[PDB]
Design a protein around this ligand. Structure first.
Ligand code: 3DU
Ligand code: 3DU
Ligand code: CA
Ligand code: CA
Lengths: 213, 213
């Protein structure tokens, strides 16, 4: 897939999922791979452990793009506050759930347009429990995103034919990230433990990127 | 409803939803109503603005029970970390979504079992967008809770016949909280802005409590 001008550029199509819960270890690994990766996904395990100030630290130290994987899933008024606080902290983008419906997603889009940031709609998840409710809703949530002007999506890499279906719904231009055949549909992949648990994170990141070639 | 010995006692059946985003205002209001309320629900708007350390502060200053309304909705491994960090910070209980499925919920229950804390399963939400996916899943999510040994639930107060339905699924002993006759089905109500935006919060809390007679 070629880059679309109107959506974000992720260096080497590789997003680091930084789910270490200790500030020292998180900063060490991220600094090590900065020459390979410019986009870092940070979630609640790190921010609840170390504080939201860690976002600004990642930005001041590494100048990386930060996606807050907060899976926002509240009522509209609350979603607005969560997004505002998160963007105020310096996040470039936030991941939101679609299951709570269109108004809850729109609340996030509103704050993001006010503040000049981005919203990623999470369409589907990879874990077994996702079969119970999320799987059956995934296509409709994706279509809802399209009808909300959403331009950034998250989908699972485990079942590639699901990404093909997703890509059919969202169209060829929207930005899609996913936690080889994956990159025929997604614009970037998300990798955590294979990098941040390796003895040489920079080598792990380099190896993955060589495969992408 | 009479109190069940095996579930939590909420003073006056009134939970304060503290969604102010400034530490000073949040602490002021909570201290003022402590003689009326012993259980406070804190969500991401406050903790992302002020830090997770705010939880220990509420506890050390007021000795109130803290419910973290974090609407946990990630994959199982991530849910585990979020719950661990949240309980480590001192929360007595956490609210989790059921739509990501049974394994995601059980992950939270496992940590709560380990750490001696409680999980509230959110069955349904009250905003209009909840009609799209959540409403249709609500009964199945409640039944899922029953089959996960869940003893604490959250349901909407706006449609009372929905609480009666919920109560039929979860049985007469499980603990149910809901954001008058609401208390025929729920064990406590959750009130935010009517208390924390009033000129005299202690008076607003008193007025609501008098209605509970
Ligand atoms: O958000 C999703 C949705 C999925 O379907 C799968 C993983 N994830 C997230 O992606 C990340 C994957 O990290 P890894 O499994 O260590 O490579 C982690 O933060 C996990 O919570
Ligand atoms: O968790 C739910 C689920 C609902 O269906 C409705 C409100 N809530 C939460 O309950 C709280 C209600 O606060 P209030 O509307 O100010 O009274 C607030 O934190 C809101 O996010
Ligand atoms: Ca681009
Ligand atoms: Ca009791």
């Amino acid at each position: 897939r070629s880059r679309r001008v109107d959506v974000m550029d992720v260096m080497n199509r590789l997003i680091l999922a930084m789910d270490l819960m200790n500030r020292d270890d998180a900063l060490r690994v991220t600094g090590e791979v900065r020459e390979y990766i410019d986009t870092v996904k940070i979630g609640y395990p790190l921010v609840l452990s170390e504080g939201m100030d860690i976002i600004a630290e990642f930005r001041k130290r590494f100048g990386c793009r930060i996606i807050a994987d907060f899976k926002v899933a509240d009522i509209p008024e609350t979603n607005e506050k969560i997004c505002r606080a998160t963007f105020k902290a310096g996040a470039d983008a936030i991941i939101v759930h679609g299951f709570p419906g269109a108004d809850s997603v729109r609340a996030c889009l509103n704050v993001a347009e006010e503040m000049g940031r981005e919203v990623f709609l999470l369409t589907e998840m990879s874990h077994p429990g996702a079969e119970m409710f999320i799987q059956g809703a995934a296509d409709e949530i994706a279509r809802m995103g399209v009808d909300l002007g959403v331009k950034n999506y998250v989908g699972p890499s485990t079942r590639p034919e699901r990404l093909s279906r997703l890509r059919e719904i969202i169209g060829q231009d929207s930005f899609l990230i996913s936690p080889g055949e994956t990159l025929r549909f997604a614009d970037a992949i998300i990798v955590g433990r294979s990098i941040y648990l390796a003895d040489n994170p920079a080598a792990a990141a380099a190896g993955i990127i060589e495969s992408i070639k």
